[PDB]
Amino acid sequence: MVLADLGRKITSALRSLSNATIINEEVLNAMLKEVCTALLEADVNIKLVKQLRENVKSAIDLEEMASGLNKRKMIQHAVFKELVKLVDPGVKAWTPTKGKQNVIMFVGLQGSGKTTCSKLAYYYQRKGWKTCLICADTFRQLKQNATKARIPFYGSYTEMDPVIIASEGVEKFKNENFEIIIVDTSGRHKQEDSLFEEMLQVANAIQPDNIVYVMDASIGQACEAQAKAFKDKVDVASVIVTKLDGHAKGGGALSAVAATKSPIIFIGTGEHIDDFEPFKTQPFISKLLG
């Protein structure tokens, strides 16, 4: 698992608990301490780790124990359930509607992520959608990737102001009956000011059905502030997290974004076009502990 270091620590704590000769509050707190320590070592914010501990203690009532559960297993399911909550935004993410024209705009900062536009388009194409690409990269890798996947991609040759390109591109592909019309914004900004400035300029022109913020997860729990500013500036907000691997801070990023109620729809897991997967929270946590 991509969060193997956090998961190894959690499954060890649970194994120690399930092997205790007698289950009591002393044994239970030890495991919670071990779990909480693992979450902090994963850069989960202290507020969210304390909340998880409260919920697990509130959920486990050992004294009058409804029969049928083997409570060691009940304690495990209680932890499992609370890990899913920690990474779950609590909100259903937007999805394109089949037989409709869907304009999807991508947004993100410098270093936040390799050209991930092509992966979403390839994903939907592979699922049988008629899909297309619109380029906000500056005109003056991505072209060659488009040729390789055989997906028509807007090049930018005639005009340097990107809002007109985006506007014209959506029209051309709406006229050709495309179902998924994917608008790429700039990866070329280090500050939120200039990013969100162009974001509103292009959005007003093309009226996207969904705006996707692409975030570099390697900054860990500091993703929370970055996600809030984006969610506060758009109505239909989605997040795609990249660079989840290669560092210890992946868990903090996922739980930070979920704390803002912004759904993470996919994760980017490498340089290649199929290194890409939908973010389903329950299967994610299950494979980590199993």
Side-chain angles (χ1 to χ4, degrees), residues 76-94:
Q76 296 185 66
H77 295 347
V79 171
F80 176 83
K81 157 165 175 179
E82 214 58 40
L83 298 169
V84 170
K85 286 175 59 182
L86 182 67
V87 303
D88 190 303
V91 149
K92 270 184 187 91
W94 173 96

Side-chain angles (χ1 to χ4, degrees), residues 151-176:
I151 299 175
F153 175 86
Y154 279 88
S156 185
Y157 292 86
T158 50
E159 260 72 48
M160 179 70 51
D161 192 345
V163 171
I164 303 172
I165 300 181
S167 227
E168 293 180 334
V170 169
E171 283 184 48
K172 171 181 155 190
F173 277 148
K174 279 179 161 180
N175 282 336
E176 286 159 31

Side-chain angles (χ1 to χ4, degrees), residues 207-253:
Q207 306 284 49
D209 296 277
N210 188 38
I211 296 172
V212 177
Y213 192 28
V214 182
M215 293 187 359
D216 170 2
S218 64
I219 69 174
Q221 65 172 266
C223 291
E224 194 171 337
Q226 175 162 167
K228 196 180 175 240
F230 171 67
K231 192 211 169 208
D232 295 340
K233 291 193 179 50
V234 321
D235 184 26
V236 183
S238 298
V239 174
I240 288 177
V241 136
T242 68
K243 287 163 275 169
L244 204 56
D245 70 294
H247 64 83
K249 307 188 267 238

Side-chain angles (χ1 to χ4, degrees), residues 41-59:
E41 293 173 342
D43 198 28
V44 182
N45 180 261
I46 180 68
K47 180 187 188 171
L48 307 180
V49 185
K50 278 180 189 176
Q51 188 54 57
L52 177 146
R53 184 200 152 94
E54 261 183 322
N55 297 351
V56 178
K57 295 213 72 153
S58 183

